[PDB]
Structure 1
Amino acid sequence: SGAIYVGNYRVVNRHLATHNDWANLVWEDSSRDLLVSSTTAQGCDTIARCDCQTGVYYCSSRRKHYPVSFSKPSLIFVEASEYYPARYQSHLMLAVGHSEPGDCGGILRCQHGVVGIVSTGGNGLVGFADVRDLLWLDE
């Protein structure tokens, strides 16, 4: 679990969105595993606007933060699950690092702010859904 709170938006994994998230839907994209819903309180997370390839992510299955080098956002094959058939997920960045399914939502951050959230993993790899291109999150 885990979300990004910026301004009047809440950003979560689309496969983990609640009824409230869908009833207050702003934008969703199955191909990116992202859903953004509206909120009444103001969020103070800063979204990074950069091309950083190093950062730190929170791993709930270990109650620890880990530093990682990660790839540039791209289309990566993701195996079938109870939420999606086997497909290419776009805007996905991989790193070598521990992750388990319940780790989705954990934030990835660089010196500039929030980069994205855990969305995929397996075999010593962890994948993060990028949010740095969603410029509208700030206005």
Structure 2
Amino acid sequence: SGAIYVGNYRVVNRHLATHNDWANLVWEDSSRDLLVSSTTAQGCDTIARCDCQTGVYYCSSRRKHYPVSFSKPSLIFVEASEYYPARYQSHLMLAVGHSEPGDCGGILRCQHGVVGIVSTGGNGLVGFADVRDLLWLDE
């Protein structure tokens, strides 16, 4: 679990969005596993606007942060789950690191701010849904 709070927006994994997220929907994209909802309070986070390929992510299943080298956002095949059929997920970045079911929503950060959130994993890999291209989050 986990979310990004920037301005009057809450960014979460689309497959973990609540009834309240859907009732306050701003934008969602199944192909990216992202959903953004509106909030009444101002948020705590800053979004990175960079091309970093190293950062640190929070892994809830270890209660720890880990440094990672991650690939550029791209279209990657993701096996079927209870949430989605087998499909290509876009704007996804992979890295070697621990993740298991439950870790989605953990933030990935570089020195410039929030880069994205955990969205996939398995067999010593962790995938992150990029948010750096969503320029409207800051206005």
Band the TM-score falls in, shorter-chain normalisation: over 0.9
Deviation digits for residues 14-49 of structure 1 (CA, Å, limit 9, x no counterpart): 000000000000000000000000000001300000
For residues 47 and 98 of structure 1, the distance between their equivalents in structure 2, rounded to whole angstroms, comes to 24
Deviation digits for residues 49-105 of structure 1 (CA, Å, limit 9, x no counterpart): 000000000000000000000000000000000010000000000000000110000
Runs of 4+ displaced beyond 2 Å: none
TM-score (norm 2): 1.00
Larger strand percent: 1
For residues 120 and 101 of structure 2, the distance between their equivalents in structure 1, rounded to whole angstroms, comes to 8
Deviation digits for residues 118-137 of structure 1 (CA, Å, limit 9, x no counterpart): 00000100000000000000
Identify the residue that residue 121 of structure 1 maps to in structure 2. 121
Could you list the runs of 5+ residues in structure 2 that have no partner in the other structure?
none
For residues 78 and 120 of structure 1, the distance between their equivalents in structure 2, rounded to whole angstroms, comes to 8
For residues 101 and 18 of structure 2, the distance between their equivalents in structure 1, rounded to whole angstroms, comes to 17
TM-score (norm 1): 1.00
Secondary structure at the residue paired with 1:137? helix
For residues 36 and 101 of structure 1, the distance between their equivalents in structure 2, rounded to whole angstroms, comes to 21
For residues 24 and 101 of structure 1, the distance between their equivalents in structure 2, rounded to whole angstroms, comes to 26
- CA-based RMSD: 0.3
Query: Percent sequence identity over matched residues?
Result: 100
- Count of residues in correspondence between the two structures: 139
Identify the residue that residue 53 of structure 2 maps to in structure 1. 53
Identify the residue that residue 81 of structure 1 maps to in structure 2. 81
For residues 67 and 2 of structure 1, the distance between their equivalents in structure 2, rounded to whole angstroms, comes to 18
For residues 101 and 23 of structure 1, the distance between their equivalents in structure 2, rounded to whole angstroms, comes to 26
